[PDB]
Amino acid sequence: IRTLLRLVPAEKRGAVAGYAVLTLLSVLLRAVGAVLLIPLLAALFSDTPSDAWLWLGWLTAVTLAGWVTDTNTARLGFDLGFAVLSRTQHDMADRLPNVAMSWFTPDNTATARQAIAATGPELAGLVVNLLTPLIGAALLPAAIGVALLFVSVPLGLAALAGVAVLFGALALSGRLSRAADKVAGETNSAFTERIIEFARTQQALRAARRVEPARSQVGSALAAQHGAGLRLLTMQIPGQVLFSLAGQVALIGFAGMAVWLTVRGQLGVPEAIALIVVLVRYLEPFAAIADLAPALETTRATLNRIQAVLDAPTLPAGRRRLDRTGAAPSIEFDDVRFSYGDEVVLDGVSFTLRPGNTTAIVGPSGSGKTTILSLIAGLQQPASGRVLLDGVDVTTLDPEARRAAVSVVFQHPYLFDGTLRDNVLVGDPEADPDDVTAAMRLARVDELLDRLPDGDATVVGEGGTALSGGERQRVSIARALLKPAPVLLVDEATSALDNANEAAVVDALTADPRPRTRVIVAHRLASIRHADRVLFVEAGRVVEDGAIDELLAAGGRFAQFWA
Amino acid sequence: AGSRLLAPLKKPLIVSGVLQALITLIELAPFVLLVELARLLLGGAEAERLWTLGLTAVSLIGLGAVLAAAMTLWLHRVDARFAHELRGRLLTKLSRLPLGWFTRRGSASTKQLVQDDTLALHYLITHAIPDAVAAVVAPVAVLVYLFVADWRVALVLFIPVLVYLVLMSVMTIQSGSKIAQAPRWAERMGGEAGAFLEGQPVIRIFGGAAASRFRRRLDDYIDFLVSWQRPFVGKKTLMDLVTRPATFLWIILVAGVPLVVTGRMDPVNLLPFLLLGTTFGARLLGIGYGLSGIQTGMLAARRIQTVLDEPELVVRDRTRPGTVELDRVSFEYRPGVPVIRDVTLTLRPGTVTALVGPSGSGKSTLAALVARFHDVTQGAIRVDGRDIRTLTADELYRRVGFVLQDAQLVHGSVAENIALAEPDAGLERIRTAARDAQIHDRITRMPDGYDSVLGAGSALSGGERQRVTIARAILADTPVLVLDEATAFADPESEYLVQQAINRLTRDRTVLVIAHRLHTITHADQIVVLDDGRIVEVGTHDELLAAGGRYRGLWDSGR
Ligand SMILES: [Mg+2]
């Protein structure tokens, strides 16, 4: 319950206090309704049974008040559960794009997926499914025990003593089954990730024959998950036993005290028979809590994953804004240094890109030139040093102004599951259809429209897997060119393109009418014909720079690199 | 429909029905004993009879709880065992379906099928039948016994049962459609959630957090949950209050006290109602909550059995070494969308075959057909004479190795990624395979060495994960190799080295090379130009240029 209050918005704290007051009031009315039976039957069996009308009226009033309170508790619990759901899911959706790139480790990415995947109805009705009955069942025998004190002090003390073993059984059941449940949750998450990999990497797994359950990674994860699942069922046996023993101990304590008072004459026979029914009402929560306790640990793990994602380290950001009406800014690296963990990618790299010129970045593979584009676009940030757009440190820029300043063609072009037009329109959803068609024409997407059966309405798979490699690349290029960013970063836009489409797209990138600062990464000299300046990036540092013809005549690493 | 899936749980389910019928009768037995205890207690009976009934009642309360705990332990074991078996069957089926199944269905759907649907069968195959028999036998046995005692108060017990049944029926009807739509919505949100995490760089630069498709459909999904769960929970809690033991205990007394106060009833006959009349409410509430679970489970069975009934890449009965022979092959991903048109091509040992052409012309599809990821719609593909439809997966993939355009890497150690084709291969073989692909130099600089993990956020670069897949294919050492754009991202120096290593390995092997870098396939013994799904010219590099066909145009455009 403690972790839930952290996730509740500050807006809904007013409803939580009302929820808690009504939940306590509901438990009190249930206890008073159960204990009112004792005066009721005591008068009912007397020689003047008409006295029972007074107690029946109180029982009816407590019952109707029980209906109203528990209905309002359900309504408030429903609102609180969805209020927590909507706000925490929006916070995860709004925070994750700002989370640092290095945070998305395979374990953290699994955690993020599970947290978002918790949007289903199980998390939504949590306050009604779990907290409302858990709090009610836990406090009901205590409330009956407190209420019995008005009838007989030692009898109420006996009920409270029975409540002590209940919390004792609850604590021991939790502590015994925590380790097994934690391992069960870990293995279940592992199996989910391997299923996702199994469906995504299905081509490569089949070719490698690691696809049968006897051989595949998912098969091993299933074996571990089933083993952990059966162990969890084993370690819940002491929980079931301890709750049963707690119920029997409470029954023996309650019945023995009532019998002891009846023998001593401090308790009438009709009160004792009424107490049999109260004992049954007293022992029902001992069984309800047993059914609710296993779900409590699983919920705690779920909310822990949600809180972990909300606690992710957001990337630094400021509020500066470029003073350009979509005009070309200058770009510079000022002694930039960057590393992935202990691996240094860039150290001492420095360059300056003029606003209206097109610059090429080349060099061996694994040399850090995609890192340079990512730092320019703000996806990464330096460990030390600073990168400036138009003389403004991008780490101090508004995130809206940071992402409205750059449009990027990624090395591995990812497309979302949807129509081809929607992927193109992601660059600028409010685009004029004249502007969209111009973007499609420049990217040679018009070939796809005329050649594909469905045109721009062609459905793309998860990723760009329902299209060819060279076709998802052109759709991504159309997506980048549609956006009116003054900085255009091209990360191998012609890797998977034939020579004809490569030449057409390469001419289009330079022929893009609006002014921009263009940074192009290429492994093919035909794709950087128009670049005004070069940045040869080898071993993480810009070894040499100049024009293409200038470096070719120089006979440095450029000429050998293009031999 | 669904019963075909649950046939193996024939006898466990009937045994559960009978055992829970006996167990709940055992649970009702103490309250009958305690009623007899109460009647004797008013009668001033001998203490031995009071102790006997009292101690027997407490003993049977323990016995009922122990048997109930013992049953659900066994029945959850049976449910866990069946779910493990069913998940194994689903993985085995998915291991041999046509691979267009995965592409059109996605990965979120596969996660829902294997894991969530088998989990959705939980309440059906361990809680449905016990709750159903309990919710039938206990109200029937109680209400008959209390009808015999005094029908007058039994009728006011019928009232909340009728009210509860009306609430159960309208809730089931009202939420039936929404429950049917629920797995589709979870499927779609699973896809959006996966894309929101996988395509993060696209989400960041383009649109940002606010304009993303994920939040657009997240609002629709949560709105659907609110519209589904609000009236559903509303009926769900009215069922609690109607079937609440306090509600039964109140209405029992409302019809008892006026009869007791008047000369219409003796208060001794209220003892069965107060002791038994409140105990069947919680059992009726079982199926009241459980019909939604039974609906979800039955649909989940339908969604699972529909996949186990899916057509697969069956192995036929009909039943030069290293010769892959396409013959009149045609293929269409969708009906009426021919992507390959009457291709005839023979791949022979010792020859390097280059497959070039315009993008989107079906080259990778032809390579996939060689892998038998999809079966040819017409014609036949033969490996060493044997049609691939007569070859098992072991026999097929032991002959044809593949480097795929998408350099897919699996979560796990680098050695596990290179040693995917043969996980039992020694570490020396893995090192030599990596050195051939020119990735060993990068691997040694990783912090954990070959044991380093290649998950998301720790993966290699595009040009380096590609060399890992080339290292994977080199380690496989198949008599036939199919390079679907190797060195797509490799620089010209690394490209030359790895191609030199490939050209060293595959002299006695059959090579199919798909390449856009036409300068890398000038040495090929046979260049095949594929345009719009049909071959348009074949020959050597000099022959194609002299012919002046489409290859001449593409070669000129490359300059
Ligand atoms: Mg790159």
Ligand SMILES: [Mg+2]
């Ligand atoms: Mg391809």
Ligand SMILES: [Zn+2]
């Ligand atoms: Zn269960």
